[PDB]
Amino acid sequence: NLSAKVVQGSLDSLPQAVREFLENNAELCQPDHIHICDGSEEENGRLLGQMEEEGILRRLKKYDNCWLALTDPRDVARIESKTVIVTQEQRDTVPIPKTGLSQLGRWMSEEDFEKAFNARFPGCMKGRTMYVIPFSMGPLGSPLSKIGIELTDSPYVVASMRIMTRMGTPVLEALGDGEFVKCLHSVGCPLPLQKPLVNNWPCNPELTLIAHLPDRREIISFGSGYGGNSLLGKKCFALRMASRLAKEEGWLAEHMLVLGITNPEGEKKYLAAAFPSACGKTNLAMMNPSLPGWKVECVGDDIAWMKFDAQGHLRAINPENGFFGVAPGTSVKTNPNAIKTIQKNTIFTNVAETSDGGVYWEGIDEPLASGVTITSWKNKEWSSEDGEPCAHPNSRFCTPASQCPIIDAAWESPEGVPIEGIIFGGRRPAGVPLVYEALSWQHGVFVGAAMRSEAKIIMHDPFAMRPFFGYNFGKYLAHWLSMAQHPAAKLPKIFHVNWFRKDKEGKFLWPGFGENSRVLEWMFNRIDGTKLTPIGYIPKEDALNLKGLGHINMMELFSISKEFWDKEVEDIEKYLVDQVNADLPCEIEREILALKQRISQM
Ligand SMILES: CCCCn1c(=O)n(Cc2ccccc2F)c(=O)c2[nH]c(Cc3ccc(NS(=O)(=O)c4cn(C)cn4)cc3)nc21
Ligand SMILES: [Mn+2]
């Protein structure tokens, strides 16, 4: 009865668990066809083709196998306010803030979600093919990897998931009869359409909803076809759902880049890093280091799964297969390696396209030949005299990691890479030193918790996970804290960095970019064996390598003023106490207190 809708693969060759999941939602959504994805190149070809033919994608003829998708302007980003997590007890999902509404999550009762789902999903795929995407987060056959299944009515989702994950039949085989995350997605526009179609990009912003049910191990997403909303392995699974699993299983699912750094002598270390938006996260992941003799390799630019091995090493895998980076700002200057990565086999979204079939965006830093013209992401002829950008600010490239010219030899090792330092970061134009080191693990956890960052306004982003916590942030803090008790744990040095401090004239104090390799040099050697301060250790005078830099105003760059840090700790204590409240671990209350006492003596 359902086998007659299948246009590829076989119901019969599906694991029982998979088959039932599929049949259940195939029945509910009513797609005319079912297409079990085999992940093959030929399949990808025929999809790009179908998509080109349906007006969904357009090939960028300047490059080897590159494509452009343009969206409905109402559907251009991951959207927090339609994202929820569904649990029986709200408290499991978010803490109950003293004052008003939680900034740390968005809970929805199963009751309310029952009604919400039924108000969206039935018959939502009529007129459409449901694609079945089997995907592994992490190297195939890595004990650290977890498997998912995504049902979607979006060929864009399917082609992007081929890049951002390991996808295909080989995943069904590694999965066997075991567990997997159940991911359901629908652009929410059954045919015939009820509302007009813009840029051939089906979406339903009114009923848009991205919900996770951690207890049923499901991720259910409706109404958006974009990035974090539709590519379910990315934020929904790899951060939100993974954080829960990691909490149950004693490891860490985190919003961190991973890079390997080698010094001139050939000693290599892996470093992980968490940055809020607007910090050059991806730029750092592929850093071309300015110090002579040094090497930087990229393992991942977004998400890290970290688990202690038998030997006690905190090893990490990139659970992803590709980069989904923001395009605007990417240039040979800010990021040469990204530029080479995306030269082929790459899918772009809401970028501008030049008259000779290339891509374009603000900050690309690249003169156009004589009389070469530009079509904006709104599919309109564009000049630099329009005031408006040619590419949407959140526009993206979706590119294989394997194509990164500096990709790490072990970026795909099934055993992970040993992390020896965890870096937290922010954009603080004032107050916060370029770099400093935690006093302990416990104090380290608190530095993570205290993270704030500029976005005109200075906002809190604890661990850069604020939009991504899979469960109570309070219990998440306790989970990090317990990592120190893991038997034989070789715990990473914990650091905080800030590229963005400014002088009184509003000018940056640190040349940043490739020069940040001078900051990693400090971390590297600190890891191997400082000036003590109320916030942790900063470098000893003359410990930082400033050879070849101008005159750096170090004094001001590393100044720590009582007036500032009084205000800072007060803001941090108030935030954590209002927002985490009864779930705030007492060990954190002590770090606050300790900070306060060290500050009052200065
Ligand atoms: C959200 C956008 C962030 C842009 N950006 C940034 O991305 N990085 C991170 C970074 C980028 C590249 C490699 C490593 C690395 F850590 C930084 O370290 C960074 N630092 C700053 C402040 C700053 C400091 C100095 C200058 N001088 S500049 O000479 O204008 C300049 C531009 N480029 C590409 C290189 N030099 C301009 C800006 N802006 C930065
Ligand atoms: Mn991210």
Swiss-Prot record:
Mn(2+) binds at K235, H255, D302. The modification Phosphoserine is found at S10, S81, S109, S277. Gene3D superfamilies: 3.90.228.20, Phosphoenolpyruvate Carboxykinase, domain 1, Phosphoenolpyruvate Carboxykinase, domain 2. GO terms for biological process: cellular response to dexamethasone stimulus; cellular response to glucose stimulus; cellular response to insulin stimulus; cellular response to potassium ion starvation; gluconeogenesis; glucose homeostasis; glucose metabolic process; glyceraldehyde-3-phosphate biosynthetic process. Substrate binds at R78, Y226, G227, G228, S277, N394, S395, R396. Changing K62R: Abolishes acetylation and increases protein stability. Binds 1 Mn(2+) ion per subunit. GTP binds at A278, C279, G280, K281, T282, N283, R396, R427, F513, G514, E515, N516. It catalyses: oxaloacetate + GTP = phosphoenolpyruvate + GDP + CO2; L-seryl-[protein] + GTP = O-phospho-L-seryl-[protein] + GDP + H(+). Residues 448-470 are annotated as: Omega-loop. The active site is at C279. Changing K61R: Abolishes acetylation and increases protein stability. Changing C279S: Abolished both phosphoenolpyruvate carboxykinase and protein kinase activities. Major sites of expression are liver, kidney and adipocytes. In eukaryotes there are two isozymes: a cytoplasmic one and a mitochondrial one. Cytosolic phosphoenolpyruvate carboxykinase that catalyzes the reversible decarboxylation and phosphorylation of oxaloacetate (OAA) and acts as the rate-limiting enzyme in gluconeogenesis. Regulates cataplerosis and anaplerosis, the processes that control the levels of metabolic intermediates in the citric acid cycle. At low glucose levels, it catalyzes the cataplerotic conversion of oxaloacetate to phosphoenolpyruvate (PEP), the rate-limiting step in the metabolic pathway that produces glucose from lactate and other precursors derived from the citric acid cycle. Monomer. Belongs to the phosphoenolpyruvate carboxykinase [GTP] family. HAMAP family: PEPCK_GTP. This is Phosphoenolpyruvate carboxykinase, cytosolic [GTP]. It comes from Homo sapiens (Human). The lineage of its organism: Eukaryota, Metazoa, Chordata, Craniata, Vertebrata.
